[PDB]
Design a protein around this ligand. Structure first.
Ligand SMILES: Nc1ncnc2c1ncn2[C@@H]1O[C@H](COP(=O)(O)OP(=O)(O)OP(=O)(O)O)[C@@H](O)[C@H]1O
Lengths: 84, 604, 85, 438, 420
DNA sequence: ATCGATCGATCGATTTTTTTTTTTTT
DNA sequence: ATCGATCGATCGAT
């Protein structure tokens, strides 16, 4: 997922928080303005049906070994597959 | 309310526990008797009780026992508090342990479910990896030195922190510390994990064990690798090692997310899965028992007679003690009976192996070596050189039987002979030094190299083994079998009745049990012949070996001087069977004659 | 778990060398692979027997140093008879 | 009648039939919510069925019993590795044998709570994936703002049992790895699935995040995924009365001692006296425990021997299928340590765990022996123990266990000749020791 | 300016696994086998604080074994000028943690022996040696800590004990003892009662015991400036006889010897007969040991029937008697181990009662060169004689009647007093 | 005006970790 | 680096 969808229940709306790389810091409480400045902040947790997802694959890539120097070692290369 | 809801069952049970569950009257076992369960308990004041769950299922018709089931953990306190209130009513440094038994049914680990939590449940299965005991707190003094502590109470749930109310004082607290062990009441505990039974598990899924801590006097009661009925106290504990499981593991959502796991407490367990002495006096009066003990020996076997007696004789050794300063003189005894295979010599070992307590047996070929030796075990891990006994130690002060020393070759014949000298043996490999105690009566059977005779064979070279291990065991007692048409019909008769589902009615004079208890009565004795007839035994040994000087091609041997030692232990075995101390020369003749035939088997 | 070889070569040919040096652990497996259509593991909690449809061919070297015409058949071979049968 | 509830549904009967044609879709769109109405409707569909028969099952409380659908055969899911992100929650047909079965995991339902006062027992259900406890308060009410006491033994629980499963969908893309599958399950679905068994078990897809530090609130990006285990489909005996009479009839038949033998190994040719033995052993012997001891059992073990590739091995391969508890092992691949007490570390719990050996699982039913001649000398000794005591004594490692093994066994023998050859000594020909042989 | 009493026998006589919270905090004498231990470390003894803002020396505080708290507000003022220890004017003491498992000879069958922590303070520290059979009088407690944040369930303080006292397996001379004890020494005929006190219950050869009396008594090395001390220990050898008391005698010496170790022949009795130890940093530190003789140095060797010994371990046989220092190739660690032990040997002759009239080189498969290290050869007999057993069997029968020599305490003290 | 609870800014503590040389067994 | 608790003040209540 690029952006979690939290839902306020009480105030509702929709929450979208960006996430990059391997991790993120999840928001809590309610950021919704209806719950803003009102004594009661709505509860929220991620809605997986709502939030958008991206397919993520990955692979190491070894050297052909003809490219390699006579010495040293084959170099594996981390790559990450995504989408179609 | 709920205070009284259990309080209701409390007085319901408190009166109930007061009430008599013993229906047996007159002859008995005439009531109460639960109050006597207190009384005899008040005799030793061990602060624990055995009580039947079934009887509570009786009077209340289980309706309260129903409360005993799921509402159990919640309702635990009302049991003893009223009991202690009953104690206060009756008995006088007070904390108690209750043990239920005779539960309606036993439940499998796979049978285990979450609905079973808070509910006492019977379970059984083999023990695994018991742990050493550590004291638990559950009641202690913990309070801040400022202004003063004064607080010892609660904090019983596993934390074990901490003090909350009327800190510090008098400043608001909470605050900090101070746990005082000087005033705390502690108990137990050792930790164990029951392995699920082998016959229960469908192959090959393997069983799933969970940790069972042993609280109460049930601690230390555990013998590892034993299937045992377990009283429930099912409960649960937080598991912080579950991650990537994943959850959902709910949080307090100061955040530590709850993950609770199955931990089955052991509240109660059973290892399963007077007038009798008059019988002795009734037995001790009988003269023919000396013959009768023999005929009562091993009816499953056919004949062989005198061989049987020695079995009993191996079952009661000599003084195996004294005489100072010093060395402790044996003691023990040994036999290895040999002859044509299908002699059913196996009848004897399997007889007493399932007969005498802690009687140990092996194929006597591949233990492999250790077996009796230390492995020595590796790795740990984190260490190495783990010292196993193994094998024949545990039979210590008991009769050990094996087969065909020629099958284990020489390699262990060394230590086998070693245990026969030093008794207890020292052992290790590249590990720490140790000397292990084995004092163990030993018999075995190694088939003849030809399995036949070879009557002209000197038993010395006939056995395919060294004289010292030979001279050490007194004595092997060879026997041979051949066709006798009278006996062939007797064998045809006697043996098939063994095959028979009936008649199984045929019996020896004694119940094996009544003699075994009689054995222990015979075990108590330390008959010592200081009688001058012992002097008569000397020339009897002189007359024993003066003839054996010529020739040496006969049963010699020498004869060994150790033979006189066993000649001692012979009478040591005799007097016990006869129950009289200091024995007699006529008895001395018996053991002497015993050796004679024992030795003559080496003749020809 | 990651399987291969026989499990990987099932429903296909398996070429093999050093067939005498496969020792026992292999021999029994392929001994069972001659029972074919199966691979049996009782190891761990794994009780499974999985189909191996593998086609089997292995070339193996005669007893050292090379084969001796004076040497009788089956004395020269380093493989078990039940394995050759 | 049974009051079993837990209906297994069918799927697909919504097609081809009308109506529900869209429900057939709508169930596949949102299976979770669909089961929610349907498990409840089954209750009323039962209650609606009972009102016609009026008083039923004593009486209205059996309707109070919960009913639920366990739908299966939803389309055809393609292996595992194919799975789409878009497939987030939908019913899935799957197949694989269980790699490992974890110990049952307890889960939250209704959390239990208390305050400093009075102390009072008021609590609230776990409900959502969160537990929200009021700062205060019940009793005295009041307030006051005491910490909320939680006794977890009082609160509700249910079983969720994790199983890692490696599916074998075949059709493997190559070079794709033998991917496995995560599962949680619930209730009866819990523990009802034996490990190592290829199964049709179906469920919606599921993926959920996990804290990276497992301290910090931070979750790691993309969510880990597991099966919803919606439904399962793996693949004392009580015989009906009539064929039992056919047993009494077949017993009246003259050739049953023979005619059964031809049916014992119909695939096998001749060697009937050999079949005759196979015929006897299965029924071999009867228990005599006497007053005490005894127990010679019925257990009888006869070793087969002769020409190589006599298809002697096809019998045991065949007999292995026959016995309810059977045993088959090749020579030299099986070891005396493999016959009893493995006692390996569990290694997931990081603690050594004892395991019954070949002979222990051998215990009960028939056991076949390959290369008994080729068997190690440490081998047959554990067996001689079995040959006599009919039991296995394990004192090794941490604990002493003398365990009973009572089971039939038959060994395959290959003569060293390999031909047994004419004349010669008999026993010396078979190899092995006379004590072992006799 | 300090001492504490070790005191005396205090049953207890409890083993290991049998102990309870009933036994906690109250002194409990305990038995167990010595095991691996840490090196001796300095102990905080008396705490003192140079503090921070508040001034030195503030005076020493008494802590701790082992707590030392809490220094909240003091010495001036309070904090942040808070208490901290300084190297000056602070008394310390030796400290050693130790592992002692319960004795295997006392080990219940098939059950694994339990590990126990062994605390050492003051004189008690380092006095113990690993692998020793020993007694300890400690105080069992839940001590200490308890965190152990790992457990948790069920909450406990992991048990630990420090024995006030320790005793080897299982005595010393004093003035009034030795003084009259000296008066015993003046007699010349004492030599005989040394045979008389040799093995009084054994009878046996007065001659065989003579050799026993020899190595048993020990002797000066003696050093040669600045080179070899030669050999002050006797290598004892016994040619055995079947049925003879020979194996029994060395056992007499066993409880006789102050320091003694008996590994018998092999198969193998404790332990490896040689140093096999390789480390292994990792794991955790591993452990290092030598040959069987490493266990007792200056103490006499006890072995029998080398014929049953492996040739590899038998190399260390001729090895030990030679250089009188132990050495081996495994592995990375490099040292020179010096072990001096009198060496006893009794092995049964090949075959029958007497191997051959021909020279014992014919008698024994064992090489003379390895036998050469043996200064004393104990040969026994004999073919049956009439009065021979009358001289013994009558002696023996009267021996078993139980149910001249010096008291063993004196005679055992005599040699140790002498060797010292 | 005394008392409180309330929020916030103050303070400070917690974030990686198992493989190659071995060794008693036949 | 962020989260965690201490602790400080302030604005309302009685
Ligand atoms: N001269 C003797 N005086 C008293 N007792 C003796 C004598 N010779 C032998 N014995 C008795 O015989 C037994 C000999 O056992 P010991 O412990 O010496 O093993 P061993 O006979 O040396 O073993 P092996 O001869 O096989 O090496 C002892 O119990 C001892 O009482």
């Amino acid at each position: 997922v690029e952006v979690i969808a939290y839902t306020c229940d009480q105030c509702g709306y929709e929450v979208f928080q960006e996430v990059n790389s391997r991790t993120f810091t999840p928001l809590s409480e309610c950021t919704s303005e209806e719950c803003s400045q009102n004594q009661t902040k709505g509860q929220l947790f991620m809605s997986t049906r709502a939030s958008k997802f991206s397919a993520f694959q990955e692979c190491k890539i070894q050297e052909l070994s003809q490219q390699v120097p006579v010495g040293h070692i084959p170099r594996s290369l981390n790559i990450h597959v995504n989408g179609t | 309310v709920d205070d009284v809801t259990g309080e209701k069952v409390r007085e319901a049970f408190e009166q109930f526990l007061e009430d008599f569950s013993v229906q047996s009257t007159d002859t008995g076992e005439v009531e109460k008797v639960y109050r006597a369960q207190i009384e005899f308990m008040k005799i030793y004041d061990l602060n624990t009780i055995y009580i039947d769950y079934q009887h509570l299922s009786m009077r209340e018709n289980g309706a309260l026992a129903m409360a005993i089931s799921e509402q159990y953990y919640r309702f635990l306190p009302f049991l003893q508090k009223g009991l202690r209130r009953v104690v206060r009513k009756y008995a006088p440094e007070r904390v108690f342990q209750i043990s239920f038994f005779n539960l309606p049914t036993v439940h499998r680990i796979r049978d285990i479910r979450s609905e079973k939590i808070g509910s006492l449940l019977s379970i059984s299965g083999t023990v695994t990896r018991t742990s050493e005991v550590r004291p638990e707190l559950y009641k202690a003094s913990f309070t801040c030195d400022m202004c003063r502590a004064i607080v010892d109470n609660v904090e019983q749930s596993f934390k074990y922190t901490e003090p909350t109310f009327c800190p510090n004082p008098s400043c608001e607290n909470r605050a900090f510390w101070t746990l005082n062990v000087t005033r705390s009441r502690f108990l137990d505990w050792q930790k164990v994990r029951i392995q699920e039974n082998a016959n229960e598990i469908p192959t090959g899924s393997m069983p799933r064990t969970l940790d069972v801590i042993l609280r109460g006097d049930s601690v230390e009661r555990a013998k590892p690798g034993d299937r045992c009925k377990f009283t429930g106290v099912e409960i649960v504990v937080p598991d912080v090692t579950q991650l990537g499981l994943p959850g959902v593991k709910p949080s307090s959502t100061g955040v530590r997310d709850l993950t609770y796991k199955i931990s089955f407490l052991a509240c109660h367990v059973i290892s399963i899965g007077s007038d009798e002495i008059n019988e002795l006096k009734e037995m001790v009066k009988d003269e023919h028992i000396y013959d009768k003990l023999v005929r009562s020996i091993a009816p499953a076997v056919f004949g062989h007679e005198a061989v049987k007696k020695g079995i009993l004789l191996q079952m009661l050794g000599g003084v195996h003690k004294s005489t100072v300063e010093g060395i402790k003189l044996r003691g023990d005894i040994n036999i290895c009976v040999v002859g044509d295979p299908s002699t059913s010599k196996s009848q004897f070992l399997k007889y007493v192996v399932g007969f005498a307590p802690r009687s140990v047996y092996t194929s006597g070929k591949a233990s492999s070596a250790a077996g009796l030796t230390a492995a020595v075990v590796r790795d740990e891990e984190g260490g190495d050189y783990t010292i196993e006994a193994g094998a024949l130690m545990l039979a210590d002060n008991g009769i050990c039987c094996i087969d065909e020393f020629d099958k284990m070759d020489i390699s262990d014949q060394v230590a086998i002979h070693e245990a026969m000298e030093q008794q207890t043996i020292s052992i290790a490999k590249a590990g720490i030094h140790a000397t292990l105690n084995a004092r163990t009566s030993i018999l075995a059977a190694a088939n003849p190299v030809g399995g036949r005779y070879n009557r002209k064979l000197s038993l010395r070279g006939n056995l395919n083994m060294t004289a010292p291990i030979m001279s050490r065991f007194d004595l092997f007692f060879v026997i041979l079998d051949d066709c006798n048409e009278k006996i062939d019909t007797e064998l045809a008769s006697h043996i098939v009745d063994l095959h028979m589902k009936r008649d199984e009615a045929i019996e020896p004079p004694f119940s094996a049990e009544q003699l075994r208890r009689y054995i222990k009565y015979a075990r108590t004795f330390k008959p010592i012949l200081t009688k001058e007839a012992r002097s008569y035994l000397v020339e009897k040994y002189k007359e024993l070996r003066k003839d054996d000087a010529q020739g040496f091609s006969r049963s010699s041997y020498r004869i060994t001087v150790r033979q006189l030692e066993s000649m001692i232990r012979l009478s040591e075995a005799i007097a016990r069977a006869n129950c009289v101390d200091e024995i007699t020369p006529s008895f001395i003749a018996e053991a002497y004659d015993l050796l004679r035939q024992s030795i003559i088997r080496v003749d020809v | 778990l990651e399987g291969g070889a026989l499990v990987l070569a099932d429903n296909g040919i398996c070429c093999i060398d050093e067939f005498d040096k496969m020792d026992e652990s292999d021999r029994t497996a392929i001994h069972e692979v001659m029972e074919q259509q199966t691979i049996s593991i009782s190891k761990a909690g794994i009780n499974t027997t999985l189909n191996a449809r593998t086609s089997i061919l292995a070339a193996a070297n005669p007893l050292y140093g090379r084969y001796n015409p004076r040497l009788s058949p089956l004395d020269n071979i380093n493989l078990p008879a039940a394995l050759l049968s | 009648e049974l009051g079993t509830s837990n209906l297994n549904l069918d799927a697909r009967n919504l097609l081809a039939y009308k109506q529900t044609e869209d429900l057939y879709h709508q169930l596949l769109n949102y299976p979770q919510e669909v089961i929610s109405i349907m498990d409840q409707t089954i209750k009323d569909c039962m209650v609606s069925l009972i009102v016609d028969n009026n008083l039923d099952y004593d009486l209205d409380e059996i309707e109070t019993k919960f009913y639920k659908v366990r739908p299966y055969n939803v389309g055809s899911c393609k292996g595992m590795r194919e799975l789409n992100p878009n497939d987030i929650d939908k019913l899935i047909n799957l197949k694989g044998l269980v790699l490992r079965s974890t110990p049952v995991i307890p889960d939250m339902k209704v959390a239990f709570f208390k305050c400093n006062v009075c102390d009072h027992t008021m609590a609230v259900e776990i409900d959502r994936g969160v537990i929200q406890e009021p700062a205060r308060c019940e009793r005295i009410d009041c307030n006051e703002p005491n910490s909320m006491s939680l006794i977890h033994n009082r609160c509700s629980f249910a079983d969720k049992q994790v199983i890692k499963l490696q599916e074998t969908p075949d059709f493997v893309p190559d070079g794709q790895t033998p991917h496995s599958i995560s599962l949680c399950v619930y209730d009866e679905l819990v523990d009802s699935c034996r490990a190592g068994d290829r199964i049709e078990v179906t469920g919606t897809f599921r993926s959920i995040p996990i804290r990276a530090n497992s301290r910090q609130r931070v979750l790691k990006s993309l969510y880990k995924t597991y099966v919803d285990v919606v439904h399962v489909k793996v693949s004392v005996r009580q015989i009906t009365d009539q064929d039992l009479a056919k047993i009494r009839e077949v017993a009246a038949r003259e050739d049953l001692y023979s005619l059964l033998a031809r049916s014992i190994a119909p695939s096998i040719y001749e060697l009937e006296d050999v079949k005759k033995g196979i015929l006897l052993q299965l029924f071999g012997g009867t228990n005599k425990t006497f007053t005490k001891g005894g127990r010679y059992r019925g257990d009888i073990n006869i070793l087969l021997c002769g020409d190589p590739s006599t298809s002697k091995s096809q019998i045991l391969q065949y007999v292995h299928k026959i016995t309810p508890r059977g045993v088959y092992t090749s020579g030299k691949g099986s070891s005396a340590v493999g016959l009893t007490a493995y006692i390996t570390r569990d290694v997931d719990t990081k603690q050594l765990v004892l395991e019954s050996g070949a002979l222990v699982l051998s215990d009960g039913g028939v056991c076949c022996i390959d290369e008994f001649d080729k068997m190690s000398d440490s081998t047959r000794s554990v067996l001689h123990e079995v040959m006599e005591q009919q039991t296995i004594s394990i004192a090794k490692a941490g604990i002493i266990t003398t365990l009973n093994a009572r089971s039939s066994i038959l060994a395959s023998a290959n003569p060293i000749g390999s031909r047994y050859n004419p004349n010669l000594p008999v026993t010396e020909n078979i190899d092995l020791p006379p004590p072992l042989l006799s | 300016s300090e001492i504490h009493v070790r005191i005396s026998d205090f049953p207890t006589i409890y083993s290991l696994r049998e102990l309870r919270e009933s036994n906690l905090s109250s002194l409990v004498r305990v038995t167990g086998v010595v095991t691996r231990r840490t090196g001796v470390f300095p102990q905080l003894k008396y705490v003192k604080f140079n503090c921070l803002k508040c001034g030195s020396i503030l005076g020493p505080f008494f802590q701790d074994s082992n707590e030392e708290i809490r220094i909240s507000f003091c010495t001036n003022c309070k904090s942040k000028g808070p208490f901290r220890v300084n190297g000056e004017k602070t008394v310390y003491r030796n400290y050693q943690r130790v592992t002692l498992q319960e004795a295997p000879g006392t080990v219940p069958p098939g059950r694994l022996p339990r590990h126990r922590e062994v605390i050492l303070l003051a004189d008690l520290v380092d006095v113990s040696k690993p692998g020793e059979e020993v007694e300890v009088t400690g105080i069992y407690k839940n001590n200490y800590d308890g965190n152990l944040n790992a457990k948790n369930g069920f909450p406990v303080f992991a048990t630990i004990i420090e024995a006030n006292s320790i005793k080897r397996r299982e005595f010393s001379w004093t003035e009034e003892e030795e003084r009259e004890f000296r008066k015993i020494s003046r007699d010349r005929g004492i030599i005989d009662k040394i045979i008389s006190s040799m093995a009084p219950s054994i009878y046996g050869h007065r001659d065989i015991k003579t050799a026993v009396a020899c190595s048993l008594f020990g002797g000066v090395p003696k050093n040669v400036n600045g080179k070899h001390s030669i050999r002050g220990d006797i290598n004892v050898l016994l040619l055995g006889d079947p049925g003879t008391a020979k194996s029994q005698i060395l056992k007499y010496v066993e409880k006789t010897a102050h320091r003694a170790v008996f590994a018998t022949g092999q198969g193998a009795s404790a332990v490896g007969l040689t140093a096999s130890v390789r480390k292994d940093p990792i794991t955790k530190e591993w452990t290092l040991e030598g040959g069987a003789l490493v266990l007792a140095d200056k103490g006499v060797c006890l072995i029998d029937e080398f014929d049953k010994m492996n040739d590899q371990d038998r190399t260390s046989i001729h090895e030990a008697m030679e250089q009188q220092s132990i050495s081996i190739s495994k592995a990375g660690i490099v040292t020179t181990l010096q072990a001096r032990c009198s060496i006893i040997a009794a092995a049964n002759p090949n075959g029958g009662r007497y191997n051959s009239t021909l020279p014992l080189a014919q008698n024994v498969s064992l090489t003379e060169p390895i036998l050469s290290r043996f200064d004393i050869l104990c040969v026994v007999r004999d073919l049956v004689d009439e009065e021979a057993d009358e001289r013994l069997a009558t002696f023996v029968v009267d021996s078993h009647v139980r149910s001249s020599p010096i008291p063993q305490e004196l005679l055992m003290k005599y040699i140790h007093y002498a060797r010292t």
